[PDB]
Structure 1
Amino acid sequence: SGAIYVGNYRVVNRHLATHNDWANLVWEDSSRDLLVSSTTAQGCDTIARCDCQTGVYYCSSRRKHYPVSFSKPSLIFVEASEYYPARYQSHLMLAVGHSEPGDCGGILRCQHGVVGIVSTGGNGLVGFADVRDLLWLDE
């Protein structure tokens, strides 16, 4: 679990969105596993606007942060689950690192701010849904 709070927005994994998230829907993209809902309170996370390929992510299954090198956002094949059929997930970045299903929502950050959130994993690889292109999150 985990979310990004920037301005009047809450960014979560689309497969983990709540009833409240859907009742206050701003935008969602099944192909990205992202959903953004509105909030009454003001958020202070800073979104990175960069092409960083190194950063640190929070791994709840280990109660630890890990430094990683990650790939640029791309279309990557993702196995079927109770949430989605087998498909290509877009805007996804991979790194060599530990992750388990309850790890989705963990933040990946570089020196510039929030890069994205944990969205996939398995086989010693963790996948992060990028948020750096969503420029509207700041306005």
Structure 2
Amino acid sequence: SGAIYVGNYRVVNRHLATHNDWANLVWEDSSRDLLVSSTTAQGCDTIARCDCQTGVYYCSSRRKHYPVSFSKPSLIFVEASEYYPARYQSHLMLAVGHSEPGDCGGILRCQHGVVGIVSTGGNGLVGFADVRDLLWLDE
């Protein structure tokens, strides 16, 4: 579990979004596994605007932060699950590192700010849903 709070926005994994998230929907994209809902309180997370390929992510299944090298956002095949059928998930970045399903929502950060959130994993890999292209999160 986990979310990004920027301005009057809450960014979460679409497969973990609550009734309140859907009742205050701003934008959602199942191909990216992202959902953005509105908030009453102001958010103070800074979103990165860069093409960094190194950063640090939080892994709740180990209560640790890990440094990683990750690929640029791209279309990656993701096997069928209880939330989605087998499909290509877009804007997804992969790294070699530990992850378990409950790790989804953990933030990936570079020196410029928040890059994305954990969205996939398995077989010694971890996938992150990129958020750097969503320029409207700032305005």
Give the TM-score, by structure 2 length: 1.00
Partner of 1:8 in structure 2? 8
Indicate the SS of the match to 1:62.
Answer: coil
Between the aligned partners of 2:18 and 2:79, the Cα distance in structure 1 is: 23
Root mean square deviation, CA, Å: 0.1
Aligned equivalents of 1:46 and 1:94: distance in 2? 22
CA deviation profile, 1:106-137 (whole Å, cap 9, x unmatched): 00000000000000000000000000000000
2:20 corresponds to: 20
Q: Which residue in 1 is equivalent to 2:108?
A: 108
Gaps of 5+ in 1: none
Report how far residue 105 of structure 1 moved: 0.0
SS at match of 1:120: strand
Q: Which runs of 5+ in 2 are unaligned?
A: none
Tell me the TM-score normalised to structure 1 length.
1.00
- Count of matched residue positions in the alignment of Structure 1 and Structure 2: 139
Distance in 1, Cα, partners of 2:47 & 2:19: 25
Measured in 1, the distance between the counterparts of 2:52 and 2:61 equals 25
Rounded Cα–Cα distance in structure 2 between residues aligned with 1:49 and 1:112: 7
Shift in Å, 1:80 = 0.4
What is the CA-CA distance between 1:53 and the residue it aligns to? Answer: 0.1
1:89 deviation in Å? 0.0
CA offset digits 1:7-47 (Å, max 9, x no partner): 00000000000000000000000000000000000000000
Identity over aligned residues, as a percent?
Answer: 100
Q: Distance in 1 between matches of 2:106 and 2:49?
A: 19
